[PDB]
Amino acid sequence: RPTVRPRNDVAHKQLSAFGEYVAEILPKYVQQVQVSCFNELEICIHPDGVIPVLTFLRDHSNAQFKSLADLTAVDIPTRQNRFEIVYNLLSLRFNSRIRVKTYTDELTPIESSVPVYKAANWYEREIWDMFGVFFANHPDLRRILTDYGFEGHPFRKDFPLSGYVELRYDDEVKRVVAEPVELAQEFRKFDLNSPWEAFPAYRQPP
Amino acid sequence: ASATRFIQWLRNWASGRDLQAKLQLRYQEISKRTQPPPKLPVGPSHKLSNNYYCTRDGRREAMPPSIVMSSQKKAVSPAPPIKRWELSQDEPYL
Amino acid sequence: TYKYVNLREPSMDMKSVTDRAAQTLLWTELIRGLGMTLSYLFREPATINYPFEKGPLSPRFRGEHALRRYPSGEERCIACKLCEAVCPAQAITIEAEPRADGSRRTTRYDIDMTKCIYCGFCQEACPVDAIVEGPNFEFSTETHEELLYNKEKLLNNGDKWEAEIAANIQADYLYR
Amino acid sequence: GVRTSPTGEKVTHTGQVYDDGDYRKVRFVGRQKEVNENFAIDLIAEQPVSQVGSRVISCDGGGGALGHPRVYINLDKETKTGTCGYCGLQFRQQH
Amino acid sequence: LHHAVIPHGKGGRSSVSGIVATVFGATGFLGRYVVNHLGRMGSQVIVPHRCEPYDTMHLRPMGDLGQIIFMDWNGRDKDSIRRAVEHSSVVINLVGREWETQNFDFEDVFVKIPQAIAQVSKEAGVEKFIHISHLNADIKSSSKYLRSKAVGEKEVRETFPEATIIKPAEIFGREDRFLNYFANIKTVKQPVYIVDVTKGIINAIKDPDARGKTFAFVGPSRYLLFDLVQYVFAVAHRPFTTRDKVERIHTTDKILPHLPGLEDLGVEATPLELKAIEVLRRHRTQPAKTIP
Amino acid sequence: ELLQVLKRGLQQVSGHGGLRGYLRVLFRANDVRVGTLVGEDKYGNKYYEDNKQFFGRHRWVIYTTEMNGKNTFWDVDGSMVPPEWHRWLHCMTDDPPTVKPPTARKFIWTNHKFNLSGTPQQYVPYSTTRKKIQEWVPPSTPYK
Amino acid sequence: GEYVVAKLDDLINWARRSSLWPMTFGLACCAVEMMHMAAPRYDMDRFGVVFRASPRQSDVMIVAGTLTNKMAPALRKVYDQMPEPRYVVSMGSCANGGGYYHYSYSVVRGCDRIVPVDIYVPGCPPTAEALLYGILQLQKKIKREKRLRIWYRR
Amino acid sequence: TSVKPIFSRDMNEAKRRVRELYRAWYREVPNTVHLFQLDISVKQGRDKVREMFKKNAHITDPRVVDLLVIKGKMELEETIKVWKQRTHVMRFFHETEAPRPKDFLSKFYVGHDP
Ligand SMILES: CCCCCCCCCCCCCCCCCC(=O)OC[C@H](COP(=O)(O)OCCN)OC(=O)CCCCCCCCCCCCCCCCC
Ligand SMILES: NC(=O)C1=CN([C@@H]2O[C@H](COP(=O)(O)OP(=O)(O)OC[C@H]3O[C@@H](n4cnc5c(N)ncnc54)[C@H](OP(=O)(O)O)[C@@H]3O)[C@@H](O)[C@H]2O)C=CC1
Ligand code: SF4
Ligand code: SF4
Numbered sequence A: 001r002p003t004v005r006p007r008n009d010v011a012h013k014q015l016s017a018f019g020e021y022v023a024e025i026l027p028k029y030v031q032q033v034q035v036s037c038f039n040e041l042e043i044c045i046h047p048d049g050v051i052p053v054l055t056f057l058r059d060h061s062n063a064q065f066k067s068l069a070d071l072t073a074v075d076i077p078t079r080q081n082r083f084e085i086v087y088n089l090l091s092l093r094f095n096s097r098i099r100v101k102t103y104t105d106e107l108t109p110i111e112s113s114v115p116v117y118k119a120a121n122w123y124e125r126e127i128w129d130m131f132g133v134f135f136a137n138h139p140d141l142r143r144i145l146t147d148y149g150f151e152g153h154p155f156r157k158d159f160p161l162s163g164y165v166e167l168r169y170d171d172e173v174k175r176v177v178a179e180p181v182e183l184a185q186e187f188r189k190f191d192l193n194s195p196w197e198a199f200p201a202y203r204q205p206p
Numbered sequence B: 001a002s003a004t005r006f007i008q009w010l011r012n013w014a015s016g017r018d019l020q021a022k023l024q025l026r027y028q029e030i031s032k033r034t035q036p037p038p039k040l041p042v043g044p045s046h047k048l049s050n051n052y053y054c055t056r057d058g059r060r061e062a063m064p065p066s067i068v069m070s071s072q073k074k075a076v077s078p079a080p081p082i083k084r085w086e087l088s089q090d091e092p093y094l
Numbered sequence C: 001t002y003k004y005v006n007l008r009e010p011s012m013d014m015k016s017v018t019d020r021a022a023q024t025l026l027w028t029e030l031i032r033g034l035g036m037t038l039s040y041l042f043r044e045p046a047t048i049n050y051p052f053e054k055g056p057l058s059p060r061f062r063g064e065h066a067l068r069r070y071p072s073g074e075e076r077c078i079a080c081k082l083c084e085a086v087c088p089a090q091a092i093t094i095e096a097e098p099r100a101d102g103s104r105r106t107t108r109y110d111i112d113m114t115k116c117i118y119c120g121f122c123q124e125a126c127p128v129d130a131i132v133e134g135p136n137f138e139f140s141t142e143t144h145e146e147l148l149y150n151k152e153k154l155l156n157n158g159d160k161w162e163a164e165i166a167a168n169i170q171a172d173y174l175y176r
Numbered sequence D: 001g002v003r004t005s006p007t008g009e010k011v012t013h014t015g016q017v018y019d020d021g022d023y024r025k026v027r028f029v030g031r032q033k034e035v036n037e038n039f040a041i042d043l044i045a046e047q048p049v050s051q052v053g054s055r056v057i058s059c060d061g062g063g064g065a066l067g068h069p070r071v072y073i074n075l076d077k078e079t080k081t082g083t084c085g086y087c088g089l090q091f092r093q094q095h
Numbered sequence E: 001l002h003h004a005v006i007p008h009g010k011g012g013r014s015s016v017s018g019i020v021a022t023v024f025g026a027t028g029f030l031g032r033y034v035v036n037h038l039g040r041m042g043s044q045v046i047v048p049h050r051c052e053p054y055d056t057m058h059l060r061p062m063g064d065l066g067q068i069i070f071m072d073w074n075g076r077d078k079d080s081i082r083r084a085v086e087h088s089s090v091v092i093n094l095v096g097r098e099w100e101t102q103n104f105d106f107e108d109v110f111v112k113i114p115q116a117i118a119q120v121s122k123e124a125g126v127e128k129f130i131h132i133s134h135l136n137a138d139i140k141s142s143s144k145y146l147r148s149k150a151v152g153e154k155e156v157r158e159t160f161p162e163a164t165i166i167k168p169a170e171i172f173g174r175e176d177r178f179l180n181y182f183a184n185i186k187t188v189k190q191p192v193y194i195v196d197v198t199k200g201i202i203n204a205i206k207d208p209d210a211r212g213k214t215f216a217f218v219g220p221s222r223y224l225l226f227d228l229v230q231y232v233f234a235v236a237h238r239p240f241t242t243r244d245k246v247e248r249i250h251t252t253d254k255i256l257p258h259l260p261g262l263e264d265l266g267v268e269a270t271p272l273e274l275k276a277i278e279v280l281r282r283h284r285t286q287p288a289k290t291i292p
Numbered sequence F: 001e002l003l004q005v006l007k008r009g010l011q012q013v014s015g016h017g018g019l020r021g022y023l024r025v026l027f028r029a030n031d032v033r034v035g036t037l038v039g040e041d042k043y044g045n046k047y048y049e050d051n052k053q054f055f056g057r058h059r060w061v062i063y064t065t066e067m068n069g070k071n072t073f074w075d076v077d078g079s080m081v082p083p084e085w086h087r088w089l090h091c092m093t094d095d096p097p098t099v100k101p102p103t104a105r106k107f108i109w110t111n112h113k114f115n116l117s118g119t120p121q122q123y124v125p126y127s128t129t130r131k132k133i134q135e136w137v138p139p140s141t142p143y144k
Numbered sequence G: 001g002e003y004v005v006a007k008l009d010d011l012i013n014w015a016r017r018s019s020l021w022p023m024t025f026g027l028a029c030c031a032v033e034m035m036h037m038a039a040p041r042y043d044m045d046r047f048g049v050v051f052r053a054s055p056r057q058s059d060v061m062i063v064a065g066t067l068t069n070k071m072a073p074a075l076r077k078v079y080d081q082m083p084e085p086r087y088v089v090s091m092g093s094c095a096n097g098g099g100y101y102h103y104s105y106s107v108v109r110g111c112d113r114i115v116p117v118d119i120y121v122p123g124c125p126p127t128a129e130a131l132l133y134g135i136l137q138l139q140k141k142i143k144r145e146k147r148l149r150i151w152y153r154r
Numbered sequence H: 001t002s003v004k005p006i007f008s009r010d011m012n013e014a015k016r017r018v019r020e021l022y023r024a025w026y027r028e029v030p031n032t033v034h035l036f037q038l039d040i041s042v043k044q045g046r047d048k049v050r051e052m053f054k055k056n057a058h059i060t061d062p063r064v065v066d067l068l069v070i071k072g073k074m075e076l077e078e079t080i081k082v083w084k085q086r087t088h089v090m091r092f093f094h095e096t097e098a099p100r101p102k103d104f105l106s107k108f109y110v111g112h113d114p
């Protein structure tokens, strides 16, 4: 079938088997394990398990996930714990990838993973800057992307696209000043969603 | 291409290469800027029969993730260990 | 498959050691570098004599926008707003109403040329080849306001450039 | 069909013109008001009605794939002509 | 109100203040502050200029797209004045020179030119006219600068009776020729801050009770010229010009109690001590005693 | 070969019509090559080609000294090339408008204009829509 | 006398437009195309436009890429240190008006909010040739300058 | 109602961190006014610092207080180490923002906003 992406059952089984393997070894922290239809393994863990679970995946002989590919966050306001923390790891030894996910809210710190992966340093600063998630015991937690003195965390779903302040040069004070944002043309919100269901396979029970 | 014979010899000797065989500037060897019109082929879904969309609908074959464990034996690795690479036989060493 | 870029053991025979000593003292590899830049001195330069000579372009080139007409002179645009919807930069602003003869036509068609990313998505989305990116790339201005195109400006661009635009569309439409 | 207002400002094909008391016409002082003089509404009206011998004709605007989506126009009414919704060409069933 | 000039927005750069202002003399010291405050709130500003466009470049960032419009004009050409003002609701005249030139003497900048602007503005139907005069304007002054300011101040009041006339004291500020003048080297002075004068001008545009009035803009404190110059040198960390200019600096600042001032436009005068260092910091390589 | 190089140099003075014409193109265009005249447009621009030059230098235009009432002896502009020749000069096509002329349309500009920024003919943007809300006009006669 | 003033304007104008030394803020994508303007095909140096000049010997600032709020103060400082006469060329949609990031919380919507701008080069990015057209347009703007003619008439 | 603490385990410990931060800010203002060549007085700088603390006086959540101090320390680090420029320091004073009307009538005259 030329237009349909082919399945790979061999990889699906291997990843499923390793998913059970991880969950048997770390029952204290693993809450859910799933493999996607395009064969990506996700471990969902209690936030207490960050250091133990990441250390096990880095150091264990059947894991050896030596490379932290990415660390980011997702904001889902409807959840009690709105922030989902995502670790994407790579194992060169076994030519495999794994995703570890945990959660936190505005006021609950997450343990910094710099001790496991030195790559985590700047990623956690970016998560602090863009989402406002505090990482405990970080060697140097501060903003990395936003302007100095910037207020708020832009990547939160409830932060407006254009922010609250805009800059310009002011001649009277001979410097760049910040002022409440006004737009000559407001961003035009589009309602694009079709009112007809697209994917029956994902229908949520009513 | 307009360089005199002496200048060609000079810059060839200075560079150590035969520069005239691989000039950086393009001349007549390039494609004409006007070409005959194309007639492109059509994909495998361009059929009048035996072509119902439900048999070639990739998006509708996507499924939600398979849950292998939820909070509701031999050891394994995520995949077989990667195989050692082989040294190039075209040119193993620069 | 892999290869080593820098895994070689220098020969320690006296003939080779003296070869490296001569290179160190006589600067031979530095002299070799001088030859390469010398050989360029006597090569023809690649420079072209702009604006009397122009860099080559293809019929697909995405330049200044224009609104086109049918051969009769009627506007091609029917205010469908597909260009405005697809525009990645929201650079297009359209308003429309029935024309005096009842035709479906725009009363506003603005492109903020300083929002536009010159991506060509508008001309892909257009069902009647009304909005195109033309071949002109020499329209820099002295003021910001001059780059806020309204419908009159865009129609004038179409009348100004149609001769070239039509020929470019003729050469590429069979690839679309 | 370009005309000037009492102020002398040209009216656009969309009917736009600044009225007497509008300060905004100061933007044109020392410069000019861009106006396109080829009014499409007048140009299409100059096209003759095409006489055809069927109840239904099709229009694609000319040039095949370079025109507009092909539509079919019903010519049953003799009171008026059939007008293409895309290009404005008119058709009439003969006798 | 014509629909185009009804205010909208929140008073920022992209808002619509409803003011359409022609500012003569906008390329000078006072003009750059006036145009800035107009463009801050989204006013349409027409800038007639005599100088090179290169010399008007600092005004362009002061307004959103389209809000600052530039025009050529000649002080002696009334048609060029009519072009600049016939669409405006307020005309502000800041034209002046502290010296005379071969082509323009004080009677030109301070009488003939202001009178022509006022007359053409009257004819064109401009509702409001703001004319800057001087606190010490006086036809018996030893200064030809101040004598002309008195003659022209009278001709404007006669030509455009509803004009708001503003009489500032010496204005100090970053680009002034006052504090900077001393730093580049009997009499009581009452200098006023540039931003205070600008705010007064802006509030005069809005205040309807300001029409037909004459204001004196003065600072909060009076100083002996010697005590002021001493303070300037201390602030500039320094060990302690035409003939007409010297006469002005030695003219005591009049005290006109009957005239309304900055407090009658809602403006609090800024003490010199707060802003002196701002002006004099660049001159670096005990507050002055005030008259009660 | 050096002698042959020099004669080619001298043939450029004659190929340009003598010393004055040679100096005019040298100072106007900073280039004294002689090419084949491909054609001329109604504004006086002259178009040349020499296919022995490397791609990009094989086509050039010598701009007219006057266009639309503007002295362009020294002030030339890439926007002066009319659209029909624009396609050929940028190598978007092979053959010039003298060989494949553009399709004629009644609405196409008969007179090309160059970039008009900075002149009294510059484009000034404005809203093309009419007023949306109509205000109530009170009666002219008195009656309170 | 006015004949003298007209010819000195021509002389100083010719010198200034014939020796335009630019400072480029290579902020983003558009910096790549100015590099291609310096590259052999267009060779900006042949017009008298040196490839790189220090800010204090610069005559024209080319803002080539997106100006963020974080960078805006730094850009203004460099402009304020330029000896006069100085000109600004805004190159690309981002610098012209914010472009594809116009609605961002962190982007200045056009560098003309920070510095005055003499030439706006459109495109995302403008081609190296389009930038060269804008530079030659700035030269013509300098040719029109009449500083001494206006000085003599004050 | 059991939650993971940030630093403080109760409001008393949180308030100690607040006072340490206030002391650090109070002592740094004289240096900031000098290094950044500000045109404000040291009194103005300290009055601004006190204002910023006061608006957060009503907090009773030690975790929220902890975050406020964390952000306050980062702001102080940017100032002490001169990562900020003069424009960033002066953004606390809104020198170009004309005062918004506060009473009902003034807001009624200018627009529709509450
Ligand atoms: C009978 C017995 C008689 C007795 C007398 C016999 C004497 C003959 C034997 C002596 C010969 C010695 C030659 C002297 C030249 C200097 C040699 C030298 O200093 O080379 C070493 C120096 C650094 O070399 P390096 O690779 O860094 O390693 C050495 C340190 N570990 O390398 C360098 O200096 C590199 C220089 C870098 C700059 C490069 C730019 C120049 C390249 C082009 C130069 C062309 C030469 C110019 C010719 C002069 C023109 C007038
Ligand atoms: N600054 C002070 O201390 C006080 C000033 N005033 C008055 O306030 C007004 C402005 O003050 P200031 O801004 O300091 O004065 P400036 O000299 O700083 O600016 C004067 C303005 O007048 C313009 N101008 C001067 N002569 C002519 C002319 N012949 N034709 C056309 N335009 C001309 C200048 O334009 P160009 O740049 O083209 O020369 C400039 O824009 C003046 O009327 C001044 O007398 C009153 C009291 C105190
Ligand atoms: S080229 Fe792209 S960004 Fe520009 S108007 Fe078209 S769709 Fe919008
Ligand atoms: S230009 Fe094309 S896509 Fe855009 S509104 Fe008109 S017909 Fe639709």
Ligand code: SF4
Residues within 6 Å of the ligand: G028, G029, G030, G031, G064, G065, G066, G091, G092, G093, G094, G095, G099, G100, G123, G124, G125, G126
């Ligand atoms: S204008 Fe376009 S090319 Fe230039 S920096 Fe912005 S996105 Fe990149």
Ligand SMILES: [Zn+2]
Residues within 6 Å of the ligand: D059, D060, D061, D068, D084, D085, D086, D087, D088, D089
């Ligand atoms: Zn049709």
